[PDB]
RNA sequence: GACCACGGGUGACGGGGAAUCAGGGUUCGAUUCCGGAGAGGGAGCCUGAGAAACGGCUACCACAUCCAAGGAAGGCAGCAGGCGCGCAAAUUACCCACUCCCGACCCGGGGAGGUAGUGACGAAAAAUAACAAUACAGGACUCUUUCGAGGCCCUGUAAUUGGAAUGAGUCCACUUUAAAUCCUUUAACGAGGAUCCAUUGGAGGGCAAGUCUGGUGCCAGCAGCCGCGGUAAUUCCAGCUCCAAU
């Protein structure tokens, strides 16, 4: 389109994390707020990197649309990345599957295997079946 | 005359305590007198059962009937009579029916042609008199 | 003595609400009144 | 315990004498002059004028020779030039008592527009800003009572989106051309 | 101990602090902050560094859960929800991502906390409509002040249409978010009576409006004070119009 271009922020390298912290900012004249899928592989093509060990979040468009403003991170191997991010972040894009049992579900069988003693895994076979 | 003098400040503070005994609204406030004898209680509204329909004579320049309903209050149990606002309202409301009253004013006093009567209707069988005077709602059936 | 309440409310005639033309709300009201008053006489 | 602010305040003081009919006379021209809504932003912008006002007057209490009072006073004298109810060239204490209220709703983002000539009313000005068609610094705004500093007075322009400045056409332009093409076709 | 003890009451936890304002000041302080007390009541105690602890136990007093009648098992002024008193106050929701905390310790837990549901309870920012030339009533002006005509801006007309603009709500998307909704944008919709109808109380005063029209006739009512009501009521009940705040 020629009309959304990418500009950033704050640019500071975290070895300690292995990550590159910026805040990433989206200039579109007459578009809504670009994916993030979008802004991963436009940052990547101009960073000379993959799309794969990059992250964004946190995109807020200021009032009238246009100016859109968020945080990036460029982890330097995929491994740090995994290692060193919340495991949300990590399911935004398909790296991690979290638990799909409810809480109140674990906090039922909490007290059901608190009441036994010596034999926890007994309360907990009846309860799932 | 009043004493000026620098170290007089507790005679001061004594002497406008001892005539702030003195003031109908201060000694009416601050007794606990007031508030024990008043039926509602310090109460701005009160939950009451109607009782009686009355009809009482207005003042000695107006030859008036008003139409005045004694309640028993939940809370005490004391007997009060309470004139229907609005115009029609005397027949909206029935016996038997738990009402809401609420004040005539001027600080728990009488108010009007109605001698010895302080207190107002609303909210007969928990709908409001203003809406069924308005015809907004309409009595429960 | 208590069967007379409301006689003069169920003697007049209901008339009917007449149909009046909506009048202006907020900035317009204001700005007309500012233009322009109950001369009944 | 929460984590919020429970932090606020009243921006308007109504009148001691509500009522008053040489009061509502003065704020009903001023809203027929300035095009404003009602009489609660009078009584807004007249608080703030009465708060530095206020902060004047102590001020002037104050002893001659003192650090803080050339501090706020200065700093006062700064933002009322840069908001620009004052005067740049009457830099002095004593003459901030003399603002007036209509001075101050001269500076407003609506009568600005309209002084500057980019609707043909005051009203036309408000309902042209609801409708988000007024841009200062490339950045949309549509507060009538927003206040422009007398810094960025030149950076008034209508939008590059808005059918005005930019000319897209909007819903009634895109109906009215598609019944006129159906028709021809 | 009269410089107010001893005693009592308090619809009193204290204070940092809140309403209002010439100034001096008058009231309100559980509240989310810092300390104290309590976990129905006052008694008691073992471990622990720190308990005289009640999401520890024991006994008594009211209440009351199950009982196979030989006993067992109790305190939601913790989070929701219920009952009872009441004029007077919320969902039997989601999650440890943000805040921090506990634990052998990065990985688990937290009705502490965050988020959502109700919320006219308070504090803001705010739509409910702008223009044109027509005809009239006109206003401000210019030549003359004579019959007066002509020309630019503005007000009113369920009278004329129009052009562009716009949200409230449908609504594929995007975004925020532990996962979701509104909020910030964007596609297609979406206004003409734009009916996509702003409302509460009055028309004597205080404090802004009616010597308008009817019904009633000191009865109803209105009416905070005077007072308004014996037939043509500026205050009563209806219609129209004006007044305040929105």
Redesign the interface.
Known sequence: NDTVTIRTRKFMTNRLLQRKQMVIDVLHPGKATVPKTEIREKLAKMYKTTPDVIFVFGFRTHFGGGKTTGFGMIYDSLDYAKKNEPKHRLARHGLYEKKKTSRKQRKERKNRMKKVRGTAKANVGAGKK | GKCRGLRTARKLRSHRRDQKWHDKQYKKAHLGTALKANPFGGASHAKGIVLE?V?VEAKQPNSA?R?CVRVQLIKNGKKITAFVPN??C??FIEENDEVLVAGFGRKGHAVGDIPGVRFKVVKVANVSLLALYKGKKERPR | ??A???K???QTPKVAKQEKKKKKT??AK??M???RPNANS | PVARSWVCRKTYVTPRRPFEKSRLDQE??L??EY????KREVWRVKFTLAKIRKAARELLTLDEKDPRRLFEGNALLRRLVRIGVLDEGKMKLDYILGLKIEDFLERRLQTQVFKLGLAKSI?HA?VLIRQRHIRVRKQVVNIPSFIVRLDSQKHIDFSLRSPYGGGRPGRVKRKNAKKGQGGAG
């Open positions: 329909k009809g009937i139409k115009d029609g005397l027949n | 003595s208590l007379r309440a409301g003069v409310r169920g907020g900035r204001r700005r009144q500012y233009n | 009903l021209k809203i027929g095009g404003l809504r009602n009203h408000r």
